[PDB]
Structures are given as structure tokens and as C-alpha cells.
Amino acid sequence: DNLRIFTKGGSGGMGYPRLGGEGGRGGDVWVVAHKNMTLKQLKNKYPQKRFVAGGGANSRVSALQGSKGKDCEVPAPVGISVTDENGQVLGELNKEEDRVLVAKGGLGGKLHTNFLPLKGQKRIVHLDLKVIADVGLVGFPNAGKSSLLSRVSHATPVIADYAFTTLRPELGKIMYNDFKQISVADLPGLIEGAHMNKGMGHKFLKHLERTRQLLFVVDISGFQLSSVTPYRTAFETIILLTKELELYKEELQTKPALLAINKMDLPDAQVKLQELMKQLLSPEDFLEKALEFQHIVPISTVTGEGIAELKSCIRKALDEQ
Amino acid sequence: TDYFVIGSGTSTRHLHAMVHYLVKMYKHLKCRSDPYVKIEGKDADDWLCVDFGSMVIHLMLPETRETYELEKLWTLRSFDDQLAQIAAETLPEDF
Amino acid sequence: FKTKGVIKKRCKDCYKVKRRGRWFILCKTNPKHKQRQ
Amino acid sequence: AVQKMTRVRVVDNSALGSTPYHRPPRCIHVYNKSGVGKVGDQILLAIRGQKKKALIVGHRMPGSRMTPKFDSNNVVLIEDNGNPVGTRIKIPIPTSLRRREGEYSKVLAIAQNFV
Amino acid sequence: WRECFPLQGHDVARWFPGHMAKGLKKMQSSLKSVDCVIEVHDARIPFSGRNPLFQELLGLKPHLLVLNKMDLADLTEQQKIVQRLEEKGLSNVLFTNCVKDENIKQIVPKVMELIRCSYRYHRAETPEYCIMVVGVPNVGKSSLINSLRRQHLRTGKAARVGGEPGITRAVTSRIQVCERPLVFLLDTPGVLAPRIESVETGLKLALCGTVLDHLVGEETMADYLLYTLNRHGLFGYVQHYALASACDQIEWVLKNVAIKLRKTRKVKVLTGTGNVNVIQPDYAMAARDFLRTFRSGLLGQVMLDRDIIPA
RNA sequence: CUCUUAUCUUUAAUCAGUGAAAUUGACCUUUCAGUGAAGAGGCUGAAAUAUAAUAAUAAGACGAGAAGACCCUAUGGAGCUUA
RNA sequence: CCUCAUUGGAUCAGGACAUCCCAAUGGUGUAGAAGCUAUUAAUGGUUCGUUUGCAACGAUUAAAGUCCUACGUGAUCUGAGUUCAGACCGGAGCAAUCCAGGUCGGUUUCUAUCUAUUUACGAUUUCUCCCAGUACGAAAGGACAAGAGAAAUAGAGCCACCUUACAAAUAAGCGCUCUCAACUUAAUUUAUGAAUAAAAUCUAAAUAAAAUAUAUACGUACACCCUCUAACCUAGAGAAGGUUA
Ligand SMILES: Nc1nc2c(ncn2[C@@H]2O[C@H](COP(=O)(O)OP(=O)(O)NP(=O)(O)O)[C@@H](O)[C@H]2O)c(=O)[nH]1
Ligand SMILES: Nc1nc2c(ncn2[C@@H]2O[C@H](COP(=O)(O)OP(=O)(O)NP(=O)(O)O)[C@@H](O)[C@H]2O)c(=O)[nH]1
Ligand SMILES: [Mg+2]
Ligand SMILES: [Mg+2]
Ligand SMILES: [Mg+2]
Ligand SMILES: [Mg+2]
Ligand SMILES: [Mg+2]
Ligand SMILES: [Mg+2]
Ligand SMILES: [Mg+2]
Ligand SMILES: [Mg+2]
Ligand SMILES: [Mg+2]
Ligand SMILES: [Mg+2]
Ligand SMILES: [Mg+2]
Ligand SMILES: [Mg+2]
Ligand SMILES: [Mg+2]
Ligand SMILES: [Mg+2]
Ligand SMILES: [Mg+2]
Ligand SMILES: [Mg+2]
Ligand SMILES: [Mg+2]
Ligand SMILES: [Mg+2]
Ligand SMILES: [Zn+2]
Fold first, then answer.
1. Subset of residues 11-30 in chain C with CB less than 7 angstroms from any atom in strand G
2. How far apart are CA A252 and CA E40, in angstroms?
3. Which parts of the chain span the membrane according to its record (chain C)?
4. What are the φ/ψ torsions at residue A58 (nearest 5 degrees)?
5. Which of A19, A18, A24 is nearest to A58 (CA)?
């Protein structure tokens, strides 16, 4: 849903000397808002991604002025954000009837001025619908997010046994007795830091930016996860999660979020769950300000215990904002 | 029809679910000799009407129910307030 | 099946046959590789 | 039989028709493969600068035996989604509309008198 | 009193006859021999109509805008109009009344000075300054030929001036206008656009008389007068038509106007027992006369484009 | 006009009387493909084919007519205007 | 130094296929649904208006194909244009006049001699219902084949009703009824199996099948050798044909 598109502006028609006059401005590319469904059409149908515009007609005898060129248009999903190849946001077609001069048609060739012809501008433009889910799932590897999504919905999520798995987030809409559908997407387990784009990186972390709220899975087994030798406690993991989120974007931390305890089935996990109750809330033996939303519910995905309880809390927060 | 039924629904999604369930049960529940019933108003987003052989069911949203006021017309056959406002006329020349 | 003037194999698995008066290159692994003369 | 350019009588209580206007509505299109329109056939009116869908509920042309021939070409206005524009119909409507293939239950609900 | 004119479901005003197409070809072929191009327009409509093709097709030559029919328009904010027109890229604009030769002298000096800045290339040696006038129908485009024909040459009318649109059909030959600068004018048929922008602009563009009224009916337009006339506050129709008091309903005012003018028709109405022909007051005739008074300026000065110009 | 219909009169048609006109190299006067100058009943190669009427249609015989149009020619005219 | 002049429509259509819809298929960045691309196929069909002088739009449709027939077709009809006799403006010329500049007005007739031609057929498309709100799909959304029912149009007929006439015993449509079989193939897909050690290979190898549109193998219709003074006829221009206790 983060495809890319190249375009080329029409070239300017060359003028006709001895008072023939100007040449038609080359055709320009205007991305035009239409039915939101067009995104599937754009990426798949008309696979050639180069949108080119007709160059303006050359000035003819009798001093005919140029035809002004033939424009080109891109139907796009509503709510799309138009960004440059470099990632700079040119604009967003948030509303309908929102055309954008993405590419510039070649300046009309004029013999009287300095330049006889002029070629049209061509560029790479990213047009992307990064998943705008109602809430998003952010967790470290082996958290259990895919398993959590597996049971709430019927999505057959890829289960990440090892890190760097489930690279593409899987969108799942959660049905409710109220007939309200809530879209939840599970991205892959993220590494510590990632401000330098290490490993998985923060490239997929733009998907969370779109999501209105954040869902935090907290694997109890992750507590004191030896790994190479970080041995991160869940308390540490949350602190790292808050810190890394702030570095990537300050607003991400401010955005509404919920907490989802995982892997509480084991009796030791229940003892750790009491430790989880201890960690955060009241001050502990700390090893900046950080945020605790307190929308934390104790559940175990593998046993499917307490899953129904969490569902309610999520909907309450959603209906609120 | 023998019986006229009007029932409100929470939302458009709920309306579709109720209509589909009734038709599914209708086919299952005997009616082997009896013919089939169409679902009308699918193009409409707030009012769906299904006409069985001897019963007619209209499912609509609260506002649509309030505007049309189907209950009043059939309860009060000729004394409905909206009907009362509809008078008769003739066509005389202007002088 | 594209009807082209010259038939050329595009992969190892592609093989050639002479059916119904014409030459075909048929590839089981990749059906895109099918050509008719 | 209703055709293109016929003059029609709106038999609703809807403001679009009810309001007295010097020009009656005229049919612009008949939704059939046959250009002719009979009872139960939709048509597109040109009513007060607006293009609006409508349904024929009676006409002056003779039909098959045991059906009612009206003295005016009667029509009801329906919204684009198909819901009737007006909420009441006090003029008799033939009962054939029930069994004709199409969606007529909504109009029948709004009609008190049947002939 | 109403709040906003209903525009839902109404269609756009498409006129675009064939002569407005064959004409556009001749105008293109005539670029050879045109030093400057003059756009005439209706002062009541500063920012509407305005066939975009003229800037596009005829943009090669330098341009000058002459807002005509200034007498029957409100120009209290003329200063404001210039400010925004400067933003549009129309540095030089002229207001002129053709019938009473208002400000028509100034046009030729500006055309002279305007041409001096430009280049002439192939025609640099010709001593005759030939310029060309274009615009939408019934803007005084043909009249402007005559007003300058007399103001300078003091000779007389040379182009057929008519009330209804479409009088001048094809691109004609040159018409001599002045002797000292030796300025000739090329008269061309009025072109509107292949596609007007909005239903309202098209509705306004019919008010001033730019498009044949029967293409709009003359009944979805009379209503527009009452709206804007009441909205703008010009309560003059009451006195002119001796109406009881201000109103905002066509069926009522046109009922009064029809009675005042003693005009009635025999109209077929369709009742429930069959068609009947009944004598009735002419709603159609009143709409025409109500329109024809407005356009004659006896109902007051108007600024149809208001709150669009200020901004 | 959608979308035509019925009736009566005229004409038509059959019987009786009278009796023209343009037109006509000769005709025992076919279809298809080819050839040819946009071109074929008649030429080349295939094919079709008892003989004569009566009443209908108008694709063709570059169908028939008129002092029609269009360009060019003549050391052919004529009307009109002049510097 | 400048330049510039046959074609619409109506009626009836014959044909090409370089296919617009309908039908059979290969591939896909084809999950379903929508699409894209290519092969095969000429089957029947391919709308009604507004402004228009060439386009410009509106509302529909399964689709509103592209071309050839001397604008296909004026001894079938019609509007322009070529283009004149009258008359105006604009621009020329001393004038007469003139302009490939505007505009308004404005008569082509034909009895058919020859050729040719004038008496059946075996249906196309669309929508709804069912399968089934299922298969599929995270949801959104949402099929195929199989099966039943409605219409529209075309073709062929009819008059019990209805309608319009003859202010007749009739004729019409706006009324009513009926419409189907495929032996024979193309793209394509299978099965068996050599050249070619395969437990390969659909085969311009020998073989076995399935699979568009077409069509006439196969059906229906027709089939009789036929008196005729005359009358009568739902038969007819004449002649022919039917009927006659
Ligand atoms: N004991 C226990 N095991 C669990 C629980 N939830 C998930 N797991 C186990 O965790 C294993 C590792 O994969 P898992 O973390 O579920 O996948 P993921 O959510 O996609 N991981 P990632 O965070 O990297 O995307 C799974 O195979 C599953 O058995 C739980 O509540 N309890
Ligand atoms: N009041 C007033 N009327 C004017 C003025 N100029 C022209 N008119 C009116 O406008 C009409 C003439 O229009 P005209 O000059 O032919 O303009 P046009 O645009 O060339 N005509 P067309 O529609 O054919 O293109 C007459 O009714 C005349 O009285 C003016 O300055 N004031
Ligand atoms: Mg005789
Ligand atoms: Mg012979
Ligand atoms: Mg030949
Ligand atoms: Mg021969
Ligand atoms: Mg004879
Ligand atoms: Mg002939
Ligand atoms: Mg000589
Ligand atoms: Mg001589
Ligand atoms: Mg044909
Ligand atoms: Mg083909
Ligand atoms: Mg002929
Ligand atoms: Mg004849
Ligand atoms: Mg003369
Ligand atoms: Mg004329
Ligand atoms: Mg006359
Ligand atoms: Mg003429
Ligand atoms: Mg003959
Ligand atoms: Mg089926
Ligand atoms: Zn291959």
C-alpha cells in the first residue's frame, strides 16, 4: 500500500520563426481524486507506472498558438498522501475534488524569448496509503502479537517463531456484537533503538504513524530475555519501547495507546504478572518522562484466557476518541 | 396482506443481517411448495422491505420510520394526519 | 500463447513440440514462456 | 402508454410535485427496451429544472380485461436510492403493481387506496 | 425570504453552436495581422463567463480588457475590482459605456502605448495598427466598433448592433476606426466556452443576456433575479410593478406582474378526470418582461459577482 | 412524428371505340472472376440455360431529354466604363 | 510579397474482418469481484434526443464496432455546396465592376424498350429467481456451471376479447398466438505412445476424446394432372385456383 509512480510532463512545442509566436505549454500531470477504490486499480491495473502528458503543439504557419498540450491524470484513493521520491510530502488528497499539480508540463517553447523549446519535468512520486488502521500493534520480537490477532479475527496470521519475521503487517478487522468493525494490524517485532534504521528499521514504522492508536503486547516470557546478552525485563522493554518511539516521532508517544499483557498462563508468569503489576505505576528500582496509559489487561494468547475482556477496553477507548 | 410488520434497526449493517437471516430461515422452514420471496430495497441504504405471501415486513432506520410514519397510516386508515392535509381541487377560469 | 514470428526458448525447462501444423515452446514451470509460431 | 415528452400528473404529496407550477412535468426517458411505458414502468421526469425518477401508477390507454383504466397518466416520484419522495398517496392505485417483477412494496405501503 | 438558491439537480448551460466553432478557426487563422486583442465583457459580471480559450488561444498577442455596459452596473468598488484584476494578470482594464460614449476615448492611447512595449516582427514595417476585438455574446463587442468608429473618425455605424445574441456570425473584414493612428478593428462572433464552470456562473451569464434565454427556460432565471434583487437589497421592482410589498416567491410576484400587464393564456392542465383547457395568467410573459426590465437598467444597478470580488 | 391504419373518389386493371411522344447502328440482348481509361450482355477462363406473354420494381444499359454548370482556345463577337 | 476550393439525411441495404456486444479459450504483478493482454470465430445485433454546422453535450444499452460498395443507392426522395440573373453592408477601383469576405431571395423533366429482379422454414438478446450472501475472502465485498420464470426485438401468423375505422357481414394494431434439431471445427485442453535407454512427449507419427460461430447431412412444408355453360368465393389486376343435395 506504499507503491510508487513515475511521471513525465509534456514537452513544449517549438515556435515558428518570424512572428509565429509561442509554443503550447507541455502537458502536466494532475493526480485527481476519485472513488477511494482506485488504489487497487492503480497498483495492479495499468501496470506501467509512467504517467506521461502530451507535449504542446508546435506553432504553425499563420501564427497559430500552441494547443497548450494534453494533460495526464492519476485517479487515487481518498486520503492518500502525495510525497516525493525523497519522501517530502507534496500534499494529500484527503478530500474529494482535490487535484494536485504533481508534475510540471514543459514550459511552452517561445521563439521570441531566450529558449526556443523546453522539455517537460519528469520525477518519481511516491503515492501511498500506509495502513490507516483504527489501532496498531507494536511489540518486540516473539511478543505474541500475531497469535493475539489470530484468535480475535480469522486472519491466519504468520506466527513469528524467530525475530525478523512477519515483515508485512497483517490487517484484521475485529467484529463486535454492536456490528462495529475495528481494523487491527500486526507488524513485525521491532529492535531496540532503530533510529539508525538498524535491521528491520523504522521504514515500516510509518505504518503505525497512520494508525490512530497503539496496541502494546507485553510478553511475560520476554522479561529477562537473554538474547545475545541484553536480558531485557518487561519493565526495561517498556522503557525502551517508550524511548525508541519518542526518538522516531514525538507525536507517536502522545498518541493514544493501550497495553496488552501476554503469556500469563504459566504460574511463574502469574508471579511475574504481580511483578508486572509492581513495575511501572509506583516507582521501582530504575536502572525520559515516559508515558503509562494504564489500559493494561492481563491475558494469555496461547490459552485464549481473558481475550474477551481486552476487546471491550479497546472499543471503549476507540469510541471515546 | 393479512399481517403488516414494521421493525426498526440499529444501523444499515444490522438491517442487511436481519433480512438475510429471515430469508434463509424462510427457505429452510418448509415453504417447499410455496414460491420464493425477493429482497427489495437493497439499493436503498436505510429502508428494506420483504413481502412474503401473506405477510409484509418493512425494516428501516429510526429517522426513516419517523418521517414516513407507516404505523399511523395503517392503524388510522383514513384519519392519518399527513393524509388529512391532502385535499381536492377543481380548475376554474381566471378573470 | 503469443503468436510470434520467431520462437525462442527462454529457460532451461522450456521444451519444443510440433502440434497441429505449428511449433510450440511449452514450459510447465512458467506458463508465461509459451509461444506459438 | 407513456413516451418521451409526455405530460404527467404527480400524485404524491411531495413538495417537488405538490407545489403549483405553470409547467407540468414531462417525461425525458422511459426505462425499458421498449420505448413505451405502462403501469409499473419507471421513467425519468424533467420537473422544475430538476431530473427526477418516477414510477407510472396509471394511464389512459386501455389494458387487458379486468384492469382499471384511469383518466389521467398518474406517476409517483422515487428517490435515486429508490425510496419514494412523498409519504402519502390518496389516489387509487391498481393492485397489479404487487405482482409485476420489480420493487413496488415501498410504494404500496404508502398507498392507502387500491383498485 | 429564502437563504440560498436551490442549484441541486439543475444542469449546466450548454449553447456552443456551430458558428462559434467555425468562427474560432477563422480567429486563429487571423493572428497573422493582429497587433493587439481586445476582450469586451459585461461590467455586471467581472469574474464569470470569460471564455478561457481567449487567453489560451489568443495569448500570443498582447491583451486588453474593456468592461462594457458600465452604466447599468454598480461600480462603487471599482477600485477593488482593479486590485484583484491586477492579481489575475490583467494590468490594464477599461470601463466603457458604448451607448453614451463613456471613457471610450482612453482606449486608443492605451492600445498605442501598450503596443509600443511589444514587438511586431513581420509587421514591423506596416504603418497601420490593426487590433482585434473578442468576447462573449451581447457584451457590446459590435457596438464598440461603432462607438470608436464615430468618436475618432466621426463617420457612423458600420457593424450591425442587435439586442439578441448571435447577430454577428463570422469573422469579418477590417473596419476602419481611426485615421491619425490608422487603427482598424476585426469583429468576431461571440464565443462563450465549450463548458461553463458552475451552474451559478451559467445562471448569472444568462442574466446579462449572454446566452439565449430559452436554453434556460426563463423560469429558473426569473427566480434568480428575485433572489439576488432582494438579497442585494434593490427593492425597486415593487415600485415599478406597483406590487403590494416585497416578496421572494416567483409564483406570487409573477402573478402580480401578469395582472398588471393584463396578460393571460389558455393553458391545458391535467386534472383527475381528464385534460381541461383553462384560461390562466401568463407566468411565462411576466418572466420575460421582468427579465427585460432588469436588463434595461430600470430596476437598478447590480453587482452580480459580490463577495467574490472583495475577497 | 412514435407507427401506421380504414373508408370513398381519381388513376390503375379488364371489355368496346379512337389513337400520340421523346427515342432506335445492328441484336439470336445471361451470372461470376479476370483484363481494361474509376469502366464489360458482347473480350479471356469457369458457370448457367425449353419457348413465348401479362402485371410489378428501378440496380444497370457512363438510360433519354433542355439553349444547364465548370476550365481553356480564337490575332471570333457584343454590352458597359473610362484616365 | 500573398494565396485557396463535393458532402449530410431518408429508404433499402450487399460484402470484408483489421471483432463493438453475444460465444469458445491461453497468460497475468488473475484470492473472489472487477480488469489487462493475446488467440479463435463474421453468428445476429449494434438506441433515442439537444445545440449544431462540424462538432458539442444529455439520457440509455449486452453493445451503441472499423471499413468497402462511383456521398453504395438523386430515371426512389430530400437539405446544403459548387453558384449565377435582384439586393444590401465591409473592403477595394476614376468608373464599369470586383472579393474564393459577410448576408436575405431564388423553376430539372422523364409514359421502363432491353438486362436483372418480384412465393416457405427449423430465434437472438436481456433481467429476475434458485444454487446462495454460499465457494472465496481479515474484512470490505462477492462468483461458475447446472436449473426454473419473465419480458424486449425479429420472423411467421391470426380476430375470441380490446381499440380504430367502414355511421355493413370486413380490414388493421394499439390486440392475440407460436418459434426447434447439428452428422460435420479452431483457437485451446486431456488420454495412450514411437522416433528419443524417460516411471518422457496431445500426434503436419500411427491413435482416442472433449471443445465457438457456422451448416442442411437429418427433418417439417409441398406432393393429386386435374370437370367446367354459368353462378358464387374468406382466391384474384387479368388469367390462374376453390365451391355446386
Ligand atoms: N506460553 C505462551 N506462549 C505464547 C503465548 N502467545 C504466544 N505464544 C507463543 O509464542 C510463540 C512465538 O511466536 P509469537 O510471539 O506468537 O509470534 P509473533 O506475535 O508474530 N511475534 P513478533 O512480535 O516478532 O511479531 C508462538 O509460537 C506461540 O506458541 C502465550 O500467551 N503464552
Ligand atoms: N445599456 C447599454 N446597452 C448596450 C451597451 N453596449 C451595447 N448595448 C446593447 O447591446 C446590444 C448590442 O450588442 P452588440 O454591440 O451587437 O454586441 P456583440 O457582443 O458584438 N453581439 P453578439 O451577441 O452577436 O456577439 C444592444 O441591445 C445594445 O443596446 C452599453 O454600453 N449600454
Ligand atoms: Mg382499347
Ligand atoms: Mg437469349
Ligand atoms: Mg467484372
Ligand atoms: Mg464468356
Ligand atoms: Mg396491357
Ligand atoms: Mg433501369
Ligand atoms: Mg493564335
Ligand atoms: Mg477580334
Ligand atoms: Mg448487411
Ligand atoms: Mg478473426
Ligand atoms: Mg440512379
Ligand atoms: Mg418510373
Ligand atoms: Mg444588376
Ligand atoms: Mg436562401
Ligand atoms: Mg419568399
Ligand atoms: Mg444564396
Ligand atoms: Mg417491366
Ligand atoms: Mg446459475
Ligand atoms: Zn520457461
1. 17-22, 30
2. 58
3. none
4. -70, 145
5. A24
